[PDB]
Amino acid sequence: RFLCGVVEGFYGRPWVMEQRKELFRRLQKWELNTYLYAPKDDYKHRMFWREMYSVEEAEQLMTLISAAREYEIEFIYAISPGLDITFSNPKEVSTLKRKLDQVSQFGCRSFALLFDDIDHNMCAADKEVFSSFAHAQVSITNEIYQYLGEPETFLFCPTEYCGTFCYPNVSQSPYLRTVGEKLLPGIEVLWTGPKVVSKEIPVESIEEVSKIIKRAPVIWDNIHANDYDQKRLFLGPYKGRSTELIPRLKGVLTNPNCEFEANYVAIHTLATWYKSNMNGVRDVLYSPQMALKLALTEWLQEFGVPHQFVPGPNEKPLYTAEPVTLEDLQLLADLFYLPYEHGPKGAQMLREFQWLRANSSVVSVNCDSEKIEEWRSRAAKFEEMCGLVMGMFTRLSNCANRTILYDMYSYVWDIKSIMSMVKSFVQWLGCRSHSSAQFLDQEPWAFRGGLAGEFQRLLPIPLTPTSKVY
Amino acid sequence: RFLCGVVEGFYGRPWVMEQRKELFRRLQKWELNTYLYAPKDDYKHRMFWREMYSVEEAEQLMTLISAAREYEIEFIYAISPGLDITFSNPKEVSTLKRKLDQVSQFGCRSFALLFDDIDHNMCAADKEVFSSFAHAQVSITNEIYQYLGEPETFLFCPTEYCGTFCYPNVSQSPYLRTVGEKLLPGIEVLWTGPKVVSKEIPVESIEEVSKIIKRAPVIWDNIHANDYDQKRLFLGPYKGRSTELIPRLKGVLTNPNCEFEANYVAIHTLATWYKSNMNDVLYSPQMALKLALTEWLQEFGVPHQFVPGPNEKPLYTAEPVTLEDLQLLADLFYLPYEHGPKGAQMLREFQWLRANSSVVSVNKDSEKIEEWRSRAAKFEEMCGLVMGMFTRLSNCANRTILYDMYSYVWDIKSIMSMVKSFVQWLGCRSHSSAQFLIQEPWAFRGGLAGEFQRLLPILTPTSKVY
Numbered sequence: 001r002f003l004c005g006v007v008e009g010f011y012g013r014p015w016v017m018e019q020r021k022e023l024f025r026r027l028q029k030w031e032l033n034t035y036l037y038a039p040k041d042d043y044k045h046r047m048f049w050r051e052m053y054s055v056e057e058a059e060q061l062m063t064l065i066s067a068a069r070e071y072e073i074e075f076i077y078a079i080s081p082g083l084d085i086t087f088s089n090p091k092e093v094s095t096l097k098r099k100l101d102q103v104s105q106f107g108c109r110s111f112a113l114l115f116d117d118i119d120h121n122m123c124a125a126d127k128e129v130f131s132s133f134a135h136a137q138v139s140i141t142n143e144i145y146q147y148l149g150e151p152e153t154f155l156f157c158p159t160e161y162c163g164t165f166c167y168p169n170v171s172q173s174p175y176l177r178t179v180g181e182k183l184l185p186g187i188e189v190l191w192t193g194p195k196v197v198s199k200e201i202p203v204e205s206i207e208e209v210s211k212i213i214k215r216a217p218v219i220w221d222n223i224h225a226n227d228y229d230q231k232r233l234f235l236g237p238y239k240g241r242s243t244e245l246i247p248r249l250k251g252v253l254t255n256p257n258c259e260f261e262a263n264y265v266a267i268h269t270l271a272t273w274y275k276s277n278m279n280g281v282r283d284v285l286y287s288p289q290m291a292l293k294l295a296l297t298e299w300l301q302e303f304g305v306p307h308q309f310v311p312g313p314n315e316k317p318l319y320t321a322e323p324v325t326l327e328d329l330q331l332l333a334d335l336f337y338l339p340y341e342h343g344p345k346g347a348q349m350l351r352e353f354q355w356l357r358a359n360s361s362v363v364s365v366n367c368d369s370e371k372i373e374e375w376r377s378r379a380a381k382f383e384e385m386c387g388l389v390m391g392m393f394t395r396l397s398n399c400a401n402r403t404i405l406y407d408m409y410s411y412v413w414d415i416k417s418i419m420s421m422v423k424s425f426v427q428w429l430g431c432r433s434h435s436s437a438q439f440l441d442q443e444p445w446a447f448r449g450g451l452a453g454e455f456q457r458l459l460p461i462p463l464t465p466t467s468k469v470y
Numbered sequence: 471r472f473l474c475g476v477v478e479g480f481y482g483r484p485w486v487m488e489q490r491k492e493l494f495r496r497l498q499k500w501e502l503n504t505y506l507y508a509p510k511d512d513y514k515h516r517m518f519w520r521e522m523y524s525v526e527e528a529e530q531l532m533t534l535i536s537a538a539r540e541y542e543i544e545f546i547y548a549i550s551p552g553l554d555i556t557f558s559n560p561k562e563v564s565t566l567k568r569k570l571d572q573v574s575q576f577g578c579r580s581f582a583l584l585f586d587d588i589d590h591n592m593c594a595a596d597k598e599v600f601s602s603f604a605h606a607q608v609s610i611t612n613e614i615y616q617y618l619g620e621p622e623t624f625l626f627c628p629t630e631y632c633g634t635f636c637y638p639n640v641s642q643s644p645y646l647r648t649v650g651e652k653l654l655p656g657i658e659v660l661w662t663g664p665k666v667v668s669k670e671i672p673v674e675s676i677e678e679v680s681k682i683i684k685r686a687p688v689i690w691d692n693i694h695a696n697d698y699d700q701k702r703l704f705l706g707p708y709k710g711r712s713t714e715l716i717p718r719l720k721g722v723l724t725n726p727n728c729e730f731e732a733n734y735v736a737i738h739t740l741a742t743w744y745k746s747n748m749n750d751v752l753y754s755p756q757m758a759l760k761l762a763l764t765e766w767l768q769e770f771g772v773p774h775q776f777v778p779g780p781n782e783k784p785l786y787t788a789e790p791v792t793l794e795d796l797q798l799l800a801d802l803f804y805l806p807y808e809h810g811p812k813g814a815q816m817l818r819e820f821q822w823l824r825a826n827s828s829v830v831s832v833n834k835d836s837e838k839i840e841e842w843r844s845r846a847a848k849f850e851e852m853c854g855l856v857m858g859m860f861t862r863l864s865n866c867a868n869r870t871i872l873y874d875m876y877s878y879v880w881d882i883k884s885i886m887s888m889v890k891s892f893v894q895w896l897g898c899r900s901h902s903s904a905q906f907l908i909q910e911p912w913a914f915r916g917g918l919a920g921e922f923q924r925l926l927p928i929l930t931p932t933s934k935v936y
Contacts, residue, residue, distance in 0.1 A: 011880065011936065013873040041876070047787055047865055050776060084786040086778055095776065117936045123783040164933045195910060196935045228935050230881050231700050232917045258877075309520060309565070314594040315556040320517055335918050339911065346918045357925060398517055406483040409511070413481065414700050418919045425926060439927060442807055444667060448923065449916075450702045451802050451813045452885045456915065458824060459892055460906055461924075462590055467634050469666045469698050470481065470587045 003074070003153065003188075003218055003251030004274045005034030006267060011227040012258050014039035017060055019260045024071035030271035035068060036155070036253050038078040038114060046080035050095050052102050065107040076153060077103050078112035087122075087136035088129040096140070097147055104148065111148060112155035113141050114190075120159065133159065134178035142184050154187050155218060163194035163205060170208050180214040188250050191217035197225065199340045200240035206248050216250045223339065224256040224266040233262055233411045236337035237269040237292040243277040243285045259407040264302070265333065268295035296329045303399040320398045328392040335389070335415050345385075349419075352382045356426055364432035379426055386423035389416050424466070443467055473623070473658075473688055473721030474744045475504030475543070476737060480697040482728050484509035487530055489730045494541035500741035505538060506625070506723050508548040508584060516550035520565050522572055535577040546623060547573045548582035557592070557606035558599040566610070567617055574618065581618060582625035583611050584660075590629065603629065604648035612654050624657045625688060633664035633675060640678050650684040658720050661687035663711075667695065669807045670710040676718050686720045693806065694726040694736040703732055703878045706804035707739040707759040713747035729874040734769070735800065738762035763796045770863075774870040787865045795859045802856070802882050812852075816886075819849045823893055831899035846893055853890035856883050888912075891931040907932045 005027055008015055015023075024035065037045070044051055053061060068075035079099060086092050100111060120133050130136040137159070145154050158179055160166045166173040179189065191209055193201035201219065210216055221241075224234040234257060241252075252274070256266040269291040276285040303324045311317055334343025342350065356379055362371050393416035399405055428439050449456065475497055478485055485493070494505065507515070514521050523531065538545035549569065556562050570581060590603050600606040607629070615624050628649055630636045636643040649659065661679055663671040671689065680686055691711075694704040704727060711722075722744070726736040739758040746752040770791045778784055801810025809817065823846055829838050860883035866872055895906055907913075910932045916923065 012876045041864065041872070043869060084778075084783050086782040089778075089782060092776070123778075123781060125779070125781040126783070164930075195933070197911060227877075227880070228884070228911055229915060229917070230877050231919055232914075309561070311556055311559075311593075312595070315559060316554060316593040316596070319553040337918075340909075340914065342918050350918065350921055353922065353925065397511065402513060405511075409482045410700050413697075415919050417698070418922050422922050422926065442669065443665065444698055444806065447702075447806065448699060450699070451804075451809050451817065452701055452881050454817055455820065455885050455889050458820065459889065461913075461915075463637055464589065465635065467665070 002246070002249070002274075002278075003034040003253060004270070005032045005036070005073070005251075005253055006263075007036035007038055007220060007253040007255045009036065009038035009040065009078075009220065009255040010225055010258055011040045014042045015260055017064055020064055021067045023260075024068055024073045026267060027073050028071040030268055031275060032267070032271050033072065034074045034076065034251065034253060036076040036078055036112065038080070038112070040080070040117075045078070046083070049079050049081045049085075049099065052099060058102075058106065061103070062106045069107070074110055074153065075108055076110040076112055076155065077108045078114050078155070078157075080114040080116070082115040082118040082137075082159075085140075086125060087140055088126045093140055093143060096144060100144065100148065109151055110153040111144075111151060112157065113137075113144065114155075114157035115159045116157050116161050118159060132174065132178060134175045135182070138179060138182045141187065142182070145184055145187055150184075150186055155190055156183060156187050157190040157220065161190065161220070162192045162196055162198070163209075164196070170205075171212055173212065176209075176212045180212050183213075185215065188218050189213050189215065190220040190253075192220050192222055197222045197228075197339050198240070201242075201245060203242060203244055203248060206245060210248065216248055218251040218253060219245075219249060221252055221254045221270075224254060224263065226257045226259075226262075231411075231414065232339075233257055233259070233336040233408070234338055235262065235265050235333040236341070236343055237265060237288040237295070238273050239288045239338060239341075241273070243273065243280065246274070246277050247280050247282060261404040261407040264299040265292065265295045268298065292333065293330075296333060297326060300324065300326050300329060303396075303401050303404060306400045307403040322395055322398075324395045324399050328395060331388060331392050332396075332412065336411060349382065349385055352378060352385075353422060353426070356382060356429065360429045360432070363430055366433060376430070379430055382426060383423055386419045386426075389419040392416070440466070444469060472716070472719070472744075472748075473504040473544070473723060474740070475502045475506070475721075475723055476733075477506040477508055477690060477723040477725045479506065479508035479510065479548075479690065479725040480695055480728055481510045482697050484512045485730055487534055490534055491537045493730075494538055494543045496737060497543050498541040500738055501745060502737070502741050503542065504544045504546065504721065504723060506546040506548055506582065508550070508582070510550070510587075515548070516553065519549050519551045519554070519569065522569065528572070528576065531573070532576045539577070544580055544623065545578055546580040546582055546625065547578050548584050548625070548627075550584040550586070552585040552588040552607075552629075555610075556595055557610055558596045563610055563613060566614060570614065570618065579621055580623035581614075581621060582627065583607075583614065584625075584627035585629045586627045586631050588629060602644065602648060604645045605652070608649060608652045611657065612652070615654055615657055620654075620656055625660055626653060626657050627660040627690065631660065631690070632662045632666055632668070633679075634666070640675075641682055643682065646679075646682045650682050653683075655685065658688050659683050659685065660690045660723075662690050662692055667692045667698075667806050668710070671712075671715060673712060673714055673718065676715060680718065686718055688721040688723060689715075689719060691722055691724045691740075694724060694733070696727045696729075696732075701878075701881065702806075703727060703729070703803040703875070704805055705732065705735050705800035706808070706810055707735060707755040707762070708743050709755045709805060709808075711743070712750055713743065713752045716744070716747050731871040731874040734766040735759065735762045738765065759797075759800065763800065764793060767791065767793055767796055769871060770866045770868050773867045786861075789862055789865075791862045791866050795862060798855060798859050799863075799879065803878060816849070816852055819845060819852075820889060820893070823849060823896065827896045827899070830897055833900060843897070846897055849893060850890055853886045853893075856886040859883070888931055911935060 040046055065075050081096055115137055122133055126136055141156050160173055160175050163170055192198060194205050226232050226234055254266060254270050256263040272291040272294060273286050331345055334345035337343035359375055362375050393412050396405060396412055510516055535545050551566060585607055592603060596606055611626050630643055630645050633640055662668060664675050696702050696704055724736060724740050726733040739762050742758040742761060743753050798812055801812035804810035826842060829842050860879050863879055912932055
């Protein structure tokens with residue numbers, strides 16, 4: 001019995017009910033089994049955790065819970081009271097019971113209390129009653145677990161939810177020692193690995209934490225989360241998590257991109273990883289590369305589905321003729337790959353452009369043959385690759401599935417707009433030994449990224465135009 | 471008779487029907503009168519301009535046209551065939567007629583042909599028939615204008631839509647000379663000023679273009695457009711266009727932020743500007759901003775109890791969004807070529823602190839050091855105002871407004887938090903051995919796009935993400 005699935009647990013615009021229902025269908029299809037409702041900014045889940053749902057909201061939740069049951073997906077209702085609950089007040093604890101009990105009357109049998117991203121400071125009244133922040137949390141979590149009839153699945157998200165957050169380290173944390181000792185053993189605890197967004201989750205980091213919390217954790221995986229950086233998106237495969245973790249874990253619930261339709265790879269490849277070693281104990285089962293191909297091959301089929309003039313040899317050919325290919329998606333994913341890694345093709349373009357720039361002088365004076373025919377042929381290879389990015393954009397912009405397009409638009413627009421400008425600059429580097437033109441005062445580009453961008457930059461890390469915005 | 475209003479004319483996720491209806495209400499309330507339907511990526515407007523609307527799409531457009539009429543707003547249906555059309559083929563010109571006549575059967579009496587953002591290259595068959603790109607455009611525009619009964623309002627968007635796009639300049643462009651000469655005089659021409667996103671639209675730039683096109687243009691204003699840069703948003707006032715342009719113009723239609731609810735300031739201040747000299751002395755950008763923000767505020771407390779003791783945990787949700795929070799948010803996301811007073815100020819203070827950083831990284835020059843400390847503390851407090859702004863907005867009852875703006879407000883507060891941290895660290899340099907970043911997200915900020923952009927020519931802070 002292993003919880004594998006998705007947690008809607010990020011900041012910003014939550015998913016709407018139609019999308020949650022569609023998620024359940026995808027989860028079932030890929031043989032996953034769990035959804036955890038935890039959208040940080042759905043107002044009645046965290047900020048206003050005290051308010052009961054209205055009649056309409058109640059009707060929408062009942063329908064959603066029914067849809068989970070119909071798709072053989074376990075629906076886990078989480079709540080996040082940690083920003084302002086007075087833990088020692090029994091009127092507050094009753095409010096929390098009332099809320100959760102309203103939800104069980106919607107049909108829900110699984111629950112969670114989340115204490116992620118809050119400070120350690122307690123109010124005066126809670127310090128009189130509890131000796132540490134952990135004691136207060138564990139107390140109300142135990143009291144709520146028991147009030148709900150000790151449900152088969154109840155989750156707890158600690159404030160120290162990753163290696164780096166544990167004062168002073170994982171294995172001596174007083175916060176986690178208390179959680180391990182006092183949190184009832186039927187309750188499961190959530191963990192995100194060594195960091196908030198863990199590049200790898202090694203087996204020993206999980207043995208280490210399993211010992212102080214005294215169970216195998218459920219992983220809350222932020223690998224594909226993109227709420228922390230406006231320009232980023234993650235389409236690369238589930239990676240850096242050994243199939244050997246599966247027997248050492250109670251589950252994995254991935255918290256992925258905000259943009260719903262961008263999560264085809266993230267969820268599909270998680271499912272391939274789980275299925276690969278569903279029944280192992282205490283030979284190379286999962287290949288990230290092969291799983292990416294499986295997922296992109298299957299994602300492609302959705303682009304032609306919504307959600308006969310033929311011009312002569314002399315006439316204007318159809319702008320719309322060419323559909324999105326598999327090679328376009330392999331490329332898109334390599335440009336928007338993983339949090340600590342660009343995909344092979346993007347890393348390559350970046351490396352070639354760095355090289356062209358630092359060897360730029362070779363081509364700005366007057367013929368040095370062997371170095372020069374190297375630069376020209378790498379520069380032409382690079383110009384062709386920039387052309388593949390524009391093609392990828394152009395064909396996506398024409399696909400029949402507009403819902404997928406809109407979710408990804410601003411990302412694909414951004415990369416193609418920047419590759420177009422990079423290509424232009426490489427072209428200009430190759431004219432320096434005969435063109436007098438300079439490259440480019442004030443258009444959009446002087447202010448790129450807005451005010452945020454200016455601060456970020458000051459910290460430690462028949463003649464077509466140039467002045468095109470669109 | 472002057473067309474003033476909004477054009478939904480940007481790239482990306484278009485507005486949905488509920489939002490367009492709500493726009494009409496806002497337009498009416500602020501005494502504007504025109505909407506121009508032109509969403510670049512609504513598929514049947516440009517890419518697939520040839521396809522007729524389905525029964526459902528047809529029903530939705532009839533409803534929307536009815537709503538425009540009900541709110542005393544002129545609905546102008548635009549279409550953009552320029553990527554694909556063979557101009558010389560009469561089957562193609564007929565397809566275009568069929569499309570537009572389906573739309574007039576929805577109730578629409580006003581139309582537009584847009585040729586923005588396409589190349590000048592014609593196919594072989596069109597060069598046999600037309601001597602220039604302009605001739606071909608003007609021909610089908612005139613043919614369509616006449617077929618529809620020479621309707622009162624018909625617009626044309628040229629390919630050379632701004633000063634910088636005119637080869638070789640505005641006043642000698644063969645493309646614009648042809649447009650001025652041959653485009654029927656009842657048809658109106660769209661223009662965006664000296665540039666795509668014009669900082670100013672001076673009076674003479676409009677006299678200059680008015681003479682070669684031989685009428686007063688309608689302005690298509692991209693001042694507040696934000697489709698060209700993922701991280702940007704514009705909440706500052708309508709600025710850089712004199713009230714004296716009004717008599718020299720047939721209208722102004724603003725193409726604003728993609729995020730619907732962000733356009734409260736952009737549209738309200740445009741309306742204040744028009745009203746000021748319907749028939750700079752008359753209009754103050756600053757005063758117009760205040761008017762619009764004070765009225766915008768009222769929407770935040772509206773959607774779309776336990777009282778803790780002196781000992782107990784105080785409500786996280788207690789403090790509502792203030793007027794001072796919105797003035798600050800707007801100053802951080804102001805205009806395309808200008809930050810608002812408060813953001814320019816924070817930037818200037820932070821630049822100063824950084825370049826005088828050395829003063830505090832050694833030790834006996836007292837007056838310069840007590841200057842740095844007190845400016846550094848003043849700056850730390852201002853970074854705190856940005857976090858306040860964020861946390862109160864994140865608690866407001868109008869969730870629709872919040873969601874439209876969330877990732878921008880999150881981004882600024884997340885960066886000010888990191889800037890503040892760095893200023894704190896600069897003031898420990900004369901005793902702390904700690905380095906700034908000891909990777910986590912920050913090494914890869916902006917993604918691959920960010921790394922290319924950087925190479926073109928001009929509880930720990932790394933560890934906490936949220």
